[PDB]
Amino acid sequence: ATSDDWKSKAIYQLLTDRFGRADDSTSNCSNLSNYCGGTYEGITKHLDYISGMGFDAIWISPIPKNSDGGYHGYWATDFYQLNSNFGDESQLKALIQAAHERDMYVMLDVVANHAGPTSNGYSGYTFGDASLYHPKCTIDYNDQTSIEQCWVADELPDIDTENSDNVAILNDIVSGWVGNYSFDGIRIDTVKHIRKDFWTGYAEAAGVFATGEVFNGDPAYVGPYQKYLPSLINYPMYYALNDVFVSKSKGFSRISEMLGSNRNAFEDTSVLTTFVDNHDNPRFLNSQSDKALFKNALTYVLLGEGIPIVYYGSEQGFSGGADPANREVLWTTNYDTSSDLYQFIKTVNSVRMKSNKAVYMDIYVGDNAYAFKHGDALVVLNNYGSGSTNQVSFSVSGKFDSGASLMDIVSNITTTVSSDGTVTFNLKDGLPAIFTSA
Ligand SMILES: *[C@@H]1O[C@H](CO)[C@@H](O)[C@H](O)[C@H]1NC(C)=O
Ligand SMILES: [Ca+2]
């Protein structure tokens, strides 16, 4: 599927090892650093749980055979063999067919930069001897040559992407994964760790929409990558959202400033993928346990500028910290669709799905409150947190008619635009508000 096809989607990011199994067990996993037993069949069994929340795309773990302990898929050995932990060809195709029957997209995570660590040599690996990898070195994160030539985590064999045989093989691998399985898009791992010009050829080989992971918070660093890939993961907005909602070290001017910095660094901000947590960073609720702040952040993710990504287990209030504690098994929850955050996400996705897709950011930039439009809906965020009944007030002159009746989808709140265009109302429990006009 194309960039334009993906612009309207909202992605549920899951770890294949951690989402679901064929069995109905709610037992915890005793070691989150090794395989817990999640499978493709486990995702198929629970697709209705995911679509029930209003997601219409999933991003799954990399699929190839991995080195020991590579439950996350990022440590490939033989790129042309499936990881048998997750299932076989038939089970992966049955998942993609089940998703497609539900009009859901499937996005494959892909690695070109590295293989899994060695304990001996490279027997069994697609890149089957030391000469096919860059010499081992540690990354100097001030030196882009070091970032590209040296080994991730000091330990992941860095494929020699300047060997043209290796480039042709990497392009063949991603063309085959996408073509053989009819994936609709890819999420590209470790983009900053290979020279930019590689990515043109690799994404063309894949032949579908790609969102690249450039793990850096600076728009001036990430933005230039959109010359080479059609979308990047919005790490710069992730840091702004965390400043406003998790530490409250900035007011909402930080989100307004970051929208402007992204407009100045990126060709097309509308296709960047928005998120507030993921598998590489502590969950939101680890640092900031206030679920009203989480709900405000999730509202930004789902309705603000960009393509939303929500990390699995957000809807069950998961609160684990540093990797792998943030990679909890979902089945302890028994896929409870009555969970407050599941019903919240379903509510917000119903706005997303069914409103015009025109987003107008920065209707109001306050210190502790903020408003924007998502289609016809007026979205109001705040960082006062749980228990707040603070007043929020701002002008909507020329955006909503004077005297217009606004009704909040989240809480009971009804408010009338004043005779001169001002919206003024009290929060309920610090919750986001999503107003429509009568
Ligand atoms: C794609 O399928 C072809 C036909 O079996 C096979 O030769 C190729 O290895 C497959 N590619 C991958 C990356 O699985
Ligand atoms: Ca590299």
Residue numbers in the entry: 1 to 438
Copied sentences from the primary study:
Here, we describe the structure and function of three novel α-amylases from Cordyceps farinosa (CfAM), Rhizomucor pusillus (RpAM) and Thamnidium elegans (TeAM) with a higher stability and pH-tolerance with the potential to act as novel biocatalysts for various industrial processes. The sequence of all three enzymes groups them in the GH13 sub-family 1 along with, for example, the amylase from Aspergillus oryzae (also known as TAKA amylase). All three amylases have the classical domain structure with a central (β/α)8-barrel with the active site located on its C-terminal face, together with a small subdomain, inserted between the third strand and helix and a C-terminal β-sandwich. All three amylases have as their hallmark a shortened loop between β2/α3 and two shorter loops in subdomain B located between β3 and α4 of the central (β/α)8-barrel, compared to structures of other fungal amylases, e.g., TAKA-amylase.
